[PDB]
């Protein structure tokens, strides 16, 4: 079990850790989060009480180093930082634990929610989508735009999701225009899976990461990326049976976890109606179709 | 974006553009089978591809053989249309290629956009105009060449005959749309108006009769009368 200590909490802030969140008051004696499960990526995220604009946060894996949060009163945010001195870090964490100034990652034993949302998400892949190579953790916020959004403007602060575009030479073989547009199997299996992602695990890892950025920061380009990656599978006649079975499970936990009140902005009516009722895979997402029908029947 | 009443003169400017109409590409007669079920028999079709400025008509004849052993023909028709339009642009020298293609039906946008990905600078547009180009098969000489075709064939016409010698494109296009609108609303009456006087003939190299400026005004009047009547009848007004 690992720890992310905080230097202090000088400003009043809602702190998220994965799917959990806590209100911290201005100068409340709060010194961080303990008992973080090893084995998973995590995201620690922030919404200032005085500006419910700009949710921002840090993707990290505790196996890759010792990380702490410190408020920067010049840039006006909670910054993740790495402590290279192992003994200094253990000594700081032991003091704060002894003084019980830390919240405990509140995992229920039965509860596989975080594993099911992050199954294929790997910190090494996050760092290729979010380029800041001097840090082992990744900063995301509400406003960061995607490489594909920048084409249609600061490249350093962009989300480098794999560009998917159904009306592109990449997606459409010369002389297979109608076939490749109506059945995207070519684009899914040869171009994206074999060509770019190498395997379905990396494809699902990007899909899952795009969803979480959409849900936790209301990142609009992430949402576009999540929908595009779902639609490319649903719109392919030929998908490995294992990918379909795993996609149903992935989407089921995403829909389960979505705040009920955010369905109107985070879910694209056209993509979901097409995927569940019109597409080649209309009959292949039993779990996803049952939770969508019982939880968001208005959308459909 | 969409072409409408507000941006009408753009059709007659010096940017090469083409209208594509796919409404006569896939044509069937519906009949009873011996067992008293219904079946379709495809008949020859055409793509109506028109330069509204010059009147050059690229009539791509669609022979019934293109449908043999194909499924979902109404969907394939849209993609076949896009493939033939794409092949036509690629066949034209660079300085003759259109800067815009305007499709008369929105269902042609994605099929044409996907076939023209090689031409990112050619704008594919819809229109809000209700253009009567479906009535092109009421022009006797176009109908004759489509029905006689034994193979895929491209035939070139000027749908304005020699009008541009005496009138502007704007006026030529308005005459054409009034003639096609008439033919679409009441084919028999429209064709009676056009041929009643046997002293005004159609030249071998023309589609329409050789009317003087005065006789065109009379004809144009008779087509407007035909269209308003049929409208009163349609709508009990």
From Swiss-Prot, chain A:
GO terms for cellular component: cytoplasm; U5 snRNP. Phosphorylated on serine and tyrosine residues. Residues 244-265 are annotated as: Leucine-zipper. It is found in: Cytoplasm; Nucleus. Pfam families: AAR2, AAR2_1st. GO terms for biological process: spliceosomal snRNP assembly; spliceosomal tri-snRNP complex assembly. Keywords: Cytoplasm, mRNA processing, mRNA splicing, Nucleus, Phosphoprotein. The modification Phosphoserine is found at residue 236. InterPro entries: AAR2 (IPR007946), AAR2_C (IPR033648), AAR2_C_sf (IPR038514), Aar2_N (IPR033647), AAR2_N_sf (IPR038516). The keyword Cell wall biogenesis/degradation does not apply. The keyword Cytoplasm applies. The modification Phosphothreonine is found at residue 257. Heterodimer. Interacts with PRP8 (via RNase H homology domain and MPN domain), competing with BRR2 for the same binding site. Component of a U5 snRNP complex that contains at least the U5 snRNA, PRP8, SNU114, AAR2, SMB1, SMD1, SMD2, SMD3, SME1, SMX2 and SMX3, but is not a component of the U4/U6-U5 tri-snRNP complex. Belongs to the AAR2 family. Present with 7330 molecules/cell in log phase SD medium. Component of the U5 snRNP complex that is required for spliceosome assembly and for pre-mRNA splicing. Involved in splicing pre-mRNA of the A1 cistron and other genes that are important for cell growth. This is A1 cistron-splicing factor AAR2. It comes from Saccharomyces cerevisiae (strain ATCC 204508 / S288c). The lineage of its organism: Eukaryota, Fungi, Dikarya, Ascomycota, Saccharomycotina.
UniProtKB/Swiss-Prot annotation, chain B:
This is Pre-mRNA-splicing factor 8. Changing residue 104 to A: Reduced growth at 30 degrees Celsius. Strongly reduced growth at 16 degrees Celsius. Component of the U4/U6-U5 tri-snRNP complex composed of the U4, U6 and U5 snRNAs and at least PRP3, PRP4, PRP6, PRP8, PRP18, PRP31, PRP38, SNU13, SNU23, SNU66, SNU114, SPP381, SMB1, SMD1, SMD2, SMD3, SMX2, SMX3, LSM2, LSM3, LSM4, LSM5, LSM6, LSM7, LSM8, BRR2 and DIB1. Changing residue 22 to A: Reduced growth at 30 degrees Celsius. Strongly reduced growth at 16 degrees Celsius. Strongly reduced growth at 35 degrees Celsius. The chain holds residues 1836 to 2069 of 2413 of the full protein. Changing residue 21 to N: Reduced growth at 30 degrees Celsius. Strongly reduced growth at 16 degrees Celsius. The MPN (JAB/Mov34) domain has structural similarity with deubiquitinating enzymes, but lacks the residues that would bind the catalytic metal ion. Contains a region with structural similarity to reverse transcriptase, presenting the classical thumb, fingers and palm architecture, but lacks enzyme activity, since the essential metal-binding residues are not conserved. Functions as a scaffold that mediates the ordered assembly of spliceosomal proteins and snRNAs. Required for association of BRR2 with the spliceosomal U5 snRNP, and the subsequent assembly of the U4/U6-U5 tri-snRNP complex. Functions as a scaffold that positions spliceosomal U2, U5 and U6 snRNAs at splice sites on pre-mRNA substrates, so that splicing can occur. Interacts with both the 5' and the 3' splice site, as well as the branch region. Has a role in branch site-3' splice site selection. Associates with the branch site-3' splice 3'-exon region. Also has a role in cell cycle. It is found in: Nucleus. Present with 468 molecules/cell in log phase SD medium. Changing residue 22 to N: Reduced growth at 30 degrees Celsius. Strongly reduced growth at 16 degrees Celsius. It comes from Saccharomyces cerevisiae (strain ATCC 204508 / S288c) (Baker's yeast). Residues 7-237 are annotated as: RNase H homology domain.
């Amino acid at each position: 079990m690992n720890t992310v200590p905080f230097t202090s909490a000088p400003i009043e802030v809602t702190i998220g850790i994965d799917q959990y969140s806590f209100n911290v008051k201005e100068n409340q004696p709060f010194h961080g989060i303990k008992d973080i499960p090893i084995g998973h990526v995590h995201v620690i995220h922030f919404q200032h009480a005085d500006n419910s604009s700009m949710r921002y946060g840090y993707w990290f894996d505790c196996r890759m180093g010792n990380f702490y949060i410190q408020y920067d009163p010049k840039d006006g945010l909670y910054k993740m930082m790495e402590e290279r001195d192992g003994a200094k870090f253990e000594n700081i964490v032991h003091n704060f634990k002894e003084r019980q100034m830390m919240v405990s990652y509140p995992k229920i034993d039965e509860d596989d929610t975080w594993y099911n949302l992050t199954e294929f998400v790997q910190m090494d892949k996050i760092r290729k989508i979010v380029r800041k190579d001097e840090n082992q953790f990744s900063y995301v916020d509400s406003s960061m735009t995607t490489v594909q959004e920048n084409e249609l403007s600061d490249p350093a602060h962009s989300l480098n999701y794999t560009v998917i575009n159904f009306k592109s030479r990449e997606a459409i073989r010369p002389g297979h225009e109608m076939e490749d547009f109506l059945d995207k199997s070519y684009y899914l299996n040869t171009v994206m899976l074999q060509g770019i992602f190498k395997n379905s695990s990396n494809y699902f890892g990007e899909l899952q990461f795009a969803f979480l950025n959409a849900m936790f920061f209301g990142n609009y380009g992430s949402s576009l990326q999540w929908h595009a990656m779902i639609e490319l599978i649903c719109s392919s006649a030929t998908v490995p049976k294992h990918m379909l079975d795993k996609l149903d499970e992935i989407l089921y936990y995403q829909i389960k976890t979505l705040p009920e009140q955010y369905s109107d902005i985070l879910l694209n009516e056209r993509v979901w109606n097409i995927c569940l009722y019109s597409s080649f895979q209309k009959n292949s997402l039993h779990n996803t179709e049952k939770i969508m029908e019982n939880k968001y029947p208005e959308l459909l | 974006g969409a072409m409408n009443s507000s941006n009408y003169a753009e059709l007659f400017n010096n940017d090469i553009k083409l209208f594509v109409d796919d409404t006569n590409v896939y044509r069937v007669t519906v009949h009873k089978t011996f067992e008293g079920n219904v079946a379709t028999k495809a008949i020859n079709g055409c793509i109506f591809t028109l330069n509204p400025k010059t009147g050059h008509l690229f009539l791509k004849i669609i022979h019934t053989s293109v449908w043999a052993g194909q499924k979902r023909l109404s969907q394939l028709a849209k993609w076949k249309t896009a493939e033939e339009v794409s092949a036509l642009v690629r066949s034209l020298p660079k300085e003759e290629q259109p800067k815009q293609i305007i499709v008369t039906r929105k269902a042609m946008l994605d099929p044409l956009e996907v076939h023209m990905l090689d031409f990112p600078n050619i704008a594919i547009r819809p229109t809000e105009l209700r253009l009567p180009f479906s009535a092109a098969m009421s022009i006797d000489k176009l109908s004759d060449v489509v029905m006689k075709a034994t193979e895929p064939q491209m035939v070139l016409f000027n749908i304005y005959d020699d009008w541009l010698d005496r009138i502007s494109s704007y006026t030529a296009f308005s005459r054409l749309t009034l003639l096609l609108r008439a033919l679409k609303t009441n084919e028999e009456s429209a064709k009676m108006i056009l041929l009643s006087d046997p002293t005004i003939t159609i030249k071998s190299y023309h589609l329409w009769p050789s009317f003087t400026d005065e006789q065109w005004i009379t004809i144009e009047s008779q087509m407007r009368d035909l269209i308003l009547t049929e409208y009163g009848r349609k709508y009990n007004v």
